[PDB]
mmCIF file of C-alpha atoms in Angstrom:
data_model
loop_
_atom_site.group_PDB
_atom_site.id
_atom_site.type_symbol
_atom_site.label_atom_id
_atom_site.label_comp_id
_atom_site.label_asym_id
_atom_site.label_seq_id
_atom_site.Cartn_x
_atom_site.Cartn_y
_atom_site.Cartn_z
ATOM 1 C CA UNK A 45 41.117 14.820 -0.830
ATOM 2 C CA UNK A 46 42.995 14.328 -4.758
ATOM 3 C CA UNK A 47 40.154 13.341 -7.108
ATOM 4 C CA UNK A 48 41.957 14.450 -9.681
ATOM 5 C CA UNK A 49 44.495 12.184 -10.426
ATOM 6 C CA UNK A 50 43.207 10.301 -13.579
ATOM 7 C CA UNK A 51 41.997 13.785 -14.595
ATOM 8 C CA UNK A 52 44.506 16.550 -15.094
ATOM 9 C CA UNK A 53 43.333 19.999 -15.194
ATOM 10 C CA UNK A 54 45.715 22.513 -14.533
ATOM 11 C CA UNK A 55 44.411 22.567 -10.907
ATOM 12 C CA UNK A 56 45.902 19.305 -10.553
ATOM 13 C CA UNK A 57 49.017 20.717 -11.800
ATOM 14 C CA UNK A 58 49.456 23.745 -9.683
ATOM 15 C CA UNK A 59 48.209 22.046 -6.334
ATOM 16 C CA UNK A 60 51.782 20.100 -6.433
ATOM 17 C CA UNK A 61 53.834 22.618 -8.468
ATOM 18 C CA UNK A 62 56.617 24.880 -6.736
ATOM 19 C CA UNK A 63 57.586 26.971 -9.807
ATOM 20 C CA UNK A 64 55.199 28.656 -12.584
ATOM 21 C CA UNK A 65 55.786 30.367 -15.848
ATOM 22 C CA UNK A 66 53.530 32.685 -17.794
ATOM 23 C CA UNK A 67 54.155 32.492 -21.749
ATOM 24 C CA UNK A 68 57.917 31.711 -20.995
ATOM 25 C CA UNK A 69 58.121 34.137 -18.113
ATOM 26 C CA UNK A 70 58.590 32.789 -14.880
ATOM 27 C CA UNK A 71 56.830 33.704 -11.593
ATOM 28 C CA UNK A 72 58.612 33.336 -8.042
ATOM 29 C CA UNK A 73 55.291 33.226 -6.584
ATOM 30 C CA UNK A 74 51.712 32.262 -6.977
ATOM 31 C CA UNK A 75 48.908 31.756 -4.890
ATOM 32 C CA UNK A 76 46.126 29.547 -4.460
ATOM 33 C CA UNK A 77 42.439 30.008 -3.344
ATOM 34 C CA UNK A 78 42.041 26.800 -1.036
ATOM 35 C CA UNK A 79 39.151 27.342 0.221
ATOM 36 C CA UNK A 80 37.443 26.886 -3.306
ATOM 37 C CA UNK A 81 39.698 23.752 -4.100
ATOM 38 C CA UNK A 82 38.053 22.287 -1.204
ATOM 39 C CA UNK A 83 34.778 22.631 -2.696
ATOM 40 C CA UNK A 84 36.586 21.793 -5.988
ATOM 41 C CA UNK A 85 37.611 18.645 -4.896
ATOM 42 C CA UNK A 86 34.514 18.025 -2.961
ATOM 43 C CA UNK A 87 32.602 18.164 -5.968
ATOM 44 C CA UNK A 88 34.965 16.145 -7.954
ATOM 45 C CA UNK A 89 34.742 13.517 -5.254
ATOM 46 C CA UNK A 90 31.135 13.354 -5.765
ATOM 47 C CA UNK A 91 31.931 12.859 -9.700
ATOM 48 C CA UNK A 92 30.255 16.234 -10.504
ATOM 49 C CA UNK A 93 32.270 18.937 -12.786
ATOM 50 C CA UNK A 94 33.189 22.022 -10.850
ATOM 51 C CA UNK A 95 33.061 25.478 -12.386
ATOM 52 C CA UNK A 96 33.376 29.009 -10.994
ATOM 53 C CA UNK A 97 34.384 32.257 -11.998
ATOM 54 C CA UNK A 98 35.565 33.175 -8.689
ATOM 55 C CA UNK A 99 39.598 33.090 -8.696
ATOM 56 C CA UNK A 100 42.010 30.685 -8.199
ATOM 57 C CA UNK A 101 45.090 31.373 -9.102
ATOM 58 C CA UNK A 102 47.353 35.107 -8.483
ATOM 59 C CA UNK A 103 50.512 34.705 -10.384
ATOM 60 C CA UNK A 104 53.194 37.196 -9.267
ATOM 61 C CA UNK A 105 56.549 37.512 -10.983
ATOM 62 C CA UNK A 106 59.210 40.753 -10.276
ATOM 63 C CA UNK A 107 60.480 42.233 -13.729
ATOM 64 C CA UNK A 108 62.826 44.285 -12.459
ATOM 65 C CA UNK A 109 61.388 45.287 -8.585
ATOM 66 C CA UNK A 110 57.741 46.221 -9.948
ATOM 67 C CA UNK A 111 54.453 43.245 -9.095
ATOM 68 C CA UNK A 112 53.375 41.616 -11.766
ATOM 69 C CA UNK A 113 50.039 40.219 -11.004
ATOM 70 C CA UNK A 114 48.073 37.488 -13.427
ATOM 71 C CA UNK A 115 45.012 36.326 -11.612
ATOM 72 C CA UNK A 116 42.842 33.487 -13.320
ATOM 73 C CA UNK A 117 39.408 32.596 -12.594
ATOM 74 C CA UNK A 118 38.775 28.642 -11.654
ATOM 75 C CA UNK A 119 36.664 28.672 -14.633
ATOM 76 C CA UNK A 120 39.414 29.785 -17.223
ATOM 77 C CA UNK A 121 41.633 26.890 -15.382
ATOM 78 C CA UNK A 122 39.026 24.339 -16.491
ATOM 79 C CA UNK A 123 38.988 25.795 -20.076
ATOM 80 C CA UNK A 124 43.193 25.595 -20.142
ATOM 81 C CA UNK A 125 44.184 23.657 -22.884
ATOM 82 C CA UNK A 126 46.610 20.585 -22.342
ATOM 83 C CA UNK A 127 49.774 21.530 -24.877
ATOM 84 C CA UNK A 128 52.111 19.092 -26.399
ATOM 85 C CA UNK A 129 55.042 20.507 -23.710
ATOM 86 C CA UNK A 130 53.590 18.436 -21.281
ATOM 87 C CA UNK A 131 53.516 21.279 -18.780
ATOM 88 C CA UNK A 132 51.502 24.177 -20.502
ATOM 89 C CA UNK A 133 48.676 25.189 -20.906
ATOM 90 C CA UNK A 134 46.438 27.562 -22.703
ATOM 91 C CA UNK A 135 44.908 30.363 -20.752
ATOM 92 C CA UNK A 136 42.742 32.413 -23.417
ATOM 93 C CA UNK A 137 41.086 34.776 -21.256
ATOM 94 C CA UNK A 138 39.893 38.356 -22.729
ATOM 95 C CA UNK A 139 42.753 39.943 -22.207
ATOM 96 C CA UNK A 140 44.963 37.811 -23.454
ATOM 97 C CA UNK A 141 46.740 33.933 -23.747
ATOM 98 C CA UNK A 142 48.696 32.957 -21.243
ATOM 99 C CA UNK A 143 50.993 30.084 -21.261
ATOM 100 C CA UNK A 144 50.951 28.445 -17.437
ATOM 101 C CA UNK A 145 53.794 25.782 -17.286
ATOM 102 C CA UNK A 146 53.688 24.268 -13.884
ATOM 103 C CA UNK A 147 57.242 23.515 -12.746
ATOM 104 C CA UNK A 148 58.458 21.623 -10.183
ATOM 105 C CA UNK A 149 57.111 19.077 -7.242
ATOM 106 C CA UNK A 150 57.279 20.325 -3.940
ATOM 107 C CA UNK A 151 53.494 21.792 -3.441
ATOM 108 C CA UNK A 152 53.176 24.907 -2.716
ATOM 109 C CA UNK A 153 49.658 24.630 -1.389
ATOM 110 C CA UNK A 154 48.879 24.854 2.210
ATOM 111 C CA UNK A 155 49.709 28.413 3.120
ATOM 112 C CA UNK A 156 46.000 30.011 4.292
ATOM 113 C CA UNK A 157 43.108 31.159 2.818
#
């Protein structure tokens, strides 16, 4: 159900976060792939490390009225680096670093899909 409790990934960060900013920018919506957090957390249960390159994570923020769309594979999630905020962390993907601060407690997983 929440193996990761002890261990905080960013996945255990944005599975109870309601805000989330990108390198200081902040998103008014992101979404979650739950089906693979199931087998995420099924694997976690069973004390084995989880990695795929599938996504997990579409971050959407409106600069103006234009979509802004980050998607993040569940691998790169696992590779995020803990920073000394607290709250970010360190997506180096190849097209660039990405600051992910998860904001806010009011879980915004448990829409669908």
């Amino acid at each position: 159900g929440s193996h990761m409790t002890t261990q905080r990934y960013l996945l255990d960060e944005l599975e109870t976060a309601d805000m989330l900013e990108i390198d200081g920018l902040h998103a008014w919506r992101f979404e979650l792939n739950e089906n693979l957090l199931d087998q995420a957390d099924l694997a976690a249960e069973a004390d084995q490390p989880f990695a795929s390159e599938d996504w997990v994570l579409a971050v959407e923020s409106l600069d103006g009225r234009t979509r802004r769309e980050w998607r993040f594979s569940y691998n790169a999630v696992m590779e995020a680096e803990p920073q000394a905020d607290g709250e970010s962390w360190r997506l180096t993907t190849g097209e660039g670093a990405y600051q992910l601060r998860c904001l806010g407690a009011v879980s915004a997983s448990g829409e669908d899909e």
